[PDB]
Amino acid sequence: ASPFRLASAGEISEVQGILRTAGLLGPEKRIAYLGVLDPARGAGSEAEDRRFRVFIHDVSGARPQEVTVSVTNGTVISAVELDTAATGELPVLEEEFEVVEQLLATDERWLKALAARNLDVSKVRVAPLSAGVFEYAEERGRRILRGLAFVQDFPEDSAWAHPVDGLVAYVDVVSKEVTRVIDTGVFPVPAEHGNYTDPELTGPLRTTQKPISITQPEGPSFTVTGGNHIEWEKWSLDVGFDVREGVVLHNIAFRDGDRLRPIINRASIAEMVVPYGDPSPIRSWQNYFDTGEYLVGQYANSLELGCDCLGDITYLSPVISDAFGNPREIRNGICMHEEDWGILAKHSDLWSGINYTRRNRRMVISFFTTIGNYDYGFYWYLYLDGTIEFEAKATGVVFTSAFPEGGSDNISQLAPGLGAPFHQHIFSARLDMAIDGFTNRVEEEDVVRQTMGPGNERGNAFSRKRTVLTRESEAVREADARTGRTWIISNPESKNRLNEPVGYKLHAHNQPTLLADPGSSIARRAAFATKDLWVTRYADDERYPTGDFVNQHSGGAGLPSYIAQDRDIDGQDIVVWHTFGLTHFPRVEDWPIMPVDTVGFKLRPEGFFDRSPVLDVPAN
Amino acid sequence: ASPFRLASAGEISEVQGILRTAGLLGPEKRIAYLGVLDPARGAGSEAEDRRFRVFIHDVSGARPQEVTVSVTNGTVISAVELDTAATGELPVLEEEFEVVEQLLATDERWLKALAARNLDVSKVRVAPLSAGVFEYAEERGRRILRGLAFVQDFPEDSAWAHPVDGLVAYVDVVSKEVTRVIDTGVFPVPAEHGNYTDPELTGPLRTTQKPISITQPEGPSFTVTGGNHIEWEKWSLDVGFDVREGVVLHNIAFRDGDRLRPIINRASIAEMVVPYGDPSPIRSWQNYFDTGEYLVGQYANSLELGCDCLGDITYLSPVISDAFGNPREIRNGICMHEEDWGILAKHSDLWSGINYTRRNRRMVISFFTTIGNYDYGFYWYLYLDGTIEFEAKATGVVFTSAFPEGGSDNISQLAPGLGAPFHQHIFSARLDMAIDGFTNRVEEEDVVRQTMGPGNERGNAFSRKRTVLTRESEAVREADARTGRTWIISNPESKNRLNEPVGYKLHAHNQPTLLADPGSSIARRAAFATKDLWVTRYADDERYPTGDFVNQHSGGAGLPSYIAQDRDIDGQDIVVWHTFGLTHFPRVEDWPIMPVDTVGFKLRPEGFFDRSPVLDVPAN
Numbered sequence A, B: 001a002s003p004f005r006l007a008s009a010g011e012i013s014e015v016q017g018i019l020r021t022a023g024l025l026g027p028e029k030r031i032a033y034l035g036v037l038d039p040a041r042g043a044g045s046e047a048e049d050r051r052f053r054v055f056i057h058d059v060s061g062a063r064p065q066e067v068t069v070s071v072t073n074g075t076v077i078s079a080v081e082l083d084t085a086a087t088g089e090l091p092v093l094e095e096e097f098e099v100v101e102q103l104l105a106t107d108e109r110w111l112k113a114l115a116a117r118n119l120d121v122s123k124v125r126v127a128p129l130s131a132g133v134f135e136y137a138e139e140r141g142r143r144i145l146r147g148l149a150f151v152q153d154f155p156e157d158s159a160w161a162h163p164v165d166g167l168v169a170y171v172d173v174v175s176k177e178v179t180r181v182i183d184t185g186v187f188p189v190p191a192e193h194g195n196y197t198d199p200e201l202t203g204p205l206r207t208t209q210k211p212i213s214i215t216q217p218e219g220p221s222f223t224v225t226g227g228n229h230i231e232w233e234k235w236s237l238d239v240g241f242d243v244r245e246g247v248v249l250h251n252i253a254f255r256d257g258d259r260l261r262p263i264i265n266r267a268s269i270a271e272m273v274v275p276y277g278d279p280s281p282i283r284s285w286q287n288y289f290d291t292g293e294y295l296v297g298q299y300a301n302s303l304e305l306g307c308d309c310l311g312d313i314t315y316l317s318p319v320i321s322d323a324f325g326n327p328r329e330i331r332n333g334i335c336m337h338e339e340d341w342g343i344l345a346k347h348s349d350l351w352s353g354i355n356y357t358r359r360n361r362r363m364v365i366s367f368f369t370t371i372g373n374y375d376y377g378f379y380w381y382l383y384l385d386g387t388i389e390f391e392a393k394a395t396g397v398v399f400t401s402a403f404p405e406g407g408s409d410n411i412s413q414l415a416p417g418l419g420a421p422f423h424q425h426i427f428s429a430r431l432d433m434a435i436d437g438f439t440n441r442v443e444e445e446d447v448v449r450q451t452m453g454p455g456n457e458r459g460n461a462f463s464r465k466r467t468v469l470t471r472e473s474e475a476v477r478e479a480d481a482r483t484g485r486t487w488i489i490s491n492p493e494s495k496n497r498l499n500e501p502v503g504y505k506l507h508a509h510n511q512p513t514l515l516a517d518p519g520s521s522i523a524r525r526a527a528f529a530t531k532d533l534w535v536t537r538y539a540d541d542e543r544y545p546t547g548d549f550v551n552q553h554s555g556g557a558g559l560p561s562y563i564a565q566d567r568d569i570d571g572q573d574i575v576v577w578h579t580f581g582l583t584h585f586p587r588v589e590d591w592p593i594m595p596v597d598t599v600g601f602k603l604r605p606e607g608f609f610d611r612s613p614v615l616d617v618p619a620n
């Protein structure tokens, strides 16, 4: 009955039938994106209308369309033809992954380049990489992918160990033409393999690890109702899944006494980008938006009990659409479980004689996605004490190149002749805030140092200052770790028992933001990534920091265009967009498969409660 | 047989007898510190000599002494009388905790102040606080404690809820004189209780938490030999315990093939300080060095199975000396266990078809200490992939004051009339480095942004730069989160298979350092805390960043004096001192007992291995 329930197979089948009957899903059509729309502001009418948004690609060259469908009423609500030179191309299709390699295999320029390197075309894999927007006028309005080649010595070989440097091709995947083949010179193909399951490389496996058994003999402490509604240790929320964003959290609230208090209306990772810092023309165009260009939700892994998720695991299996509108289940795509988290609070008092210890725990909601060489785990954590935390876990295989004789300022050496270009992994979290309701504001909090002198005669005092962000034009903020800068989201109309506004404090990791020159293509297309914090006024259609159609969009879409409206954000319905990321100079230890590295953020209550919210936790 | 073994009860008894027979431990003497000395550089002689360092206090006013004893030979090696006006007072004794309250209870000025507030002297607890060095000439060379008062309504009451503001006293604990009583005015004593086990405050305890069972049916994967030598998943180390520093890690090494490779010779938390930022004369002198002034090891908790440490736990019970030289066991003072740590590495490859997942784990070595209102957990973690991490967990009860009518810029309000002054918790980690041996150097690594132009025509390139620190005078460094600054400890004479020097990278949390004015007393006494990173040349007697005798030392001891020697540190036996800390503006949620907050640092291999060191981890 909940409007936030997961999409069902029956809903997707109905969408398929509605589109087909309306003449919008002929043989030349492909669904590039399909997702349920959230209820509009003011769902207190019980008049449920399950609407779906669809992007429809046409493989024959016709204009793509954006379509909204009501499954509740069985109708097409709107259908708009898209001018992609203007508003951007549609996301990459899974079925285009193979097309780049296949088109290149019959191109005489490509075959000539492989012949000079004595490479068998049957052994050459081509990565299907998004194109961006650069100097090539013929690409405007065309659906382009760029290809970089890797050799597989045999079908089970890791091709990433054998990059073919000095060679790149550009392909129009609709007209099926190779537009350019660029060969800047022959590099030796690195010869060592990177097969991390080969006994010759691993050596004998360890026999020293003894098992760790994690069980819950009375079952878990959380309940799941309505398919995706979670209740756990005073938390309440709905777990959504979208093919673009992946796991989405709705209606995060905390039961404080007899009151259900909202905190976050919607939380998601709304974009991520991996810009490369190698100036070689073979790779200097390389920036992929895994979320906006490739759709991370459609590549979610099926997670194995005991290997991927350990303990008493509750799975969700979300349903998505394939390219033809058929429902497809991602079996065991989302893991949910609680974890012990050490000491929560402890004190032994010298005067009262009372010894007190309590243990902490967290609820974990996670999925894992794989897009080419990279694999990411997305983890949301809820803690007993009101803390909310996000963590991204990056692993997989680093993207490789040749390592030039004589070295490089922009590439790390991993093995003889094998390089890994410098790059970043930058995420955008979109937090549609609802601290005790929708009237919220953001304050920037800095530590204040004080000079020794009158009123501070011993020079020990220090303080803090809070600056309210009142309009969108002043709500683009940078980190300052040295001044301990944080941001507080508060509700000026909801006070705690001390008559102070209730709030939550955002703690960033203060990692570097986008390093590219501000005049670069990527700085214009990923403008969100140049600043740590943005605050906008809520609007239905302002969903992604990069805009709706990221692929081959010329720039400036999304957050820079939204904030130009300069709307009032002082005690209003607001959205916080937090940029955070890893800067990766690859190390030898990252090869041939990378141990996990992590980045994230957290939010902690700041006078939201009238005292510690975990006084009623029992003594185990 | 190992020279790094824990002190035994028999060793401490022998020290007691040696001191007694030498005439150094009469009835007026108290042992303020006793600890084993590490072997000198060049222990490859097998000529073991277990030596102990002792600080001896005299309650009758005689000069204290520093004494070194050889238990192996049964002799006093050296005994030096200390001039405490020059070199500092000895650490606070546990038996002095009671003396401040007892002396004040018979002082007419103190009783007059309590009478005006209608407080029963029998209900008034006095915190025994270290004095520092300020404007009071009569304190030089005298052993002073300062007292702040708190009311206990009944024996099991939390006195921290009832601070008596506006009142402070100074006491000479040797002459047993109250030197000053300062009363700046009457503040209401906050009336609400803070009893976190009272059902009226907790409400009904939760019944919703279901058990989490963590067991190891085949036992743990680590072995303990010789009492304190650990071997775990290619790691090797010795777990030490010192009454001042607490848990100390010796001889951290990693078994890489058939080679045992050193990484860290000695790791410890060598000082910690809590400076307060309230300019009221009642508290503006308040800065306690829990390690250097109070000795955190002697207040280690006995840790309970299932509550403090959960899983298959191996305990160590270190032995320390009491004030009379009797051995005292801290039963179950150190917990050791391994923990599952999620995904280690994962990839599903689109071209090879191979799906690969491995799980991570960490070895945990921890203890918990309690000094007055504060409780801290110290955690050392070793990971499968070569990462070493330290984490401090801060909990307990915040130090309180009145909350002034009309507010404060330096105090948070926690309850009606109840304040908590702003403060920091700042730690110093001393890392006696031994990356593949003792010839090490430190490089500072910054991200380098590049301008769009020739050789970077698309404005995407970025790089890194490394600066070698060659002499101690240039080895005092600050964090720079915006440039991604890290520090690499490498061995220039030990190369990996790519002919690059092996190394480890230190990742800081980049939290603010000491906020006090640089002309303040605390800035001079805690100079280490003003900078994020110091590198010194190893020397036997350079043990603590604050010097040997921190209590009432006038300033400049420790690191500022060491680095003035300007020694060569480029490929030498070096020590890294890392400052890290929390800046605490207390929140309502911290009251009446604070949920854990954390801070720390980690070190990750940086070309130390020839490839990922966890290829031989099996598939669970």
Ligand SMILES: O=CCc1ccccc1
Pocket: A127, A128, A129, A130, A288, A290, A294, A371, A372, A373, A374
């Ligand atoms: O992560 C998206 C870029 C990509 C896609 C497919 C193969 C390699 C790299």
Ligand SMILES: O=CCc1ccccc1
Pocket: B127, B128, B129, B130, B288, B290, B294, B371, B372, B373, B374
């Ligand atoms: O943490 C050392 C300062 C202290 C000691 C005893 C009681 C309260 C505070």
Ligand SMILES: [Cu+2]
Pocket: A398, A423, A424, A425, A584
């Ligand atoms: Cu990376």
Ligand SMILES: [Cu+2]
Pocket: B398, B423, B424, B425, B584
């Ligand atoms: Cu604190």
Ligand code: NA
Pocket: A085, A086, A087, A088, A553, A554, A555
């Ligand atoms: Na355009």
Ligand code: NA
Pocket: A265, A432, A433, A434, A438, A538, A572, A573, A574, A575
């Ligand atoms: Na909002």
Ligand code: NA
Pocket: B085, B086, B087, B088, B553, B554, B555
């Ligand atoms: Na002095």
Ligand code: NA
Pocket: B265, B432, B433, B434, B438, B538, B572, B573, B574, B575
């Ligand atoms: Na060293």
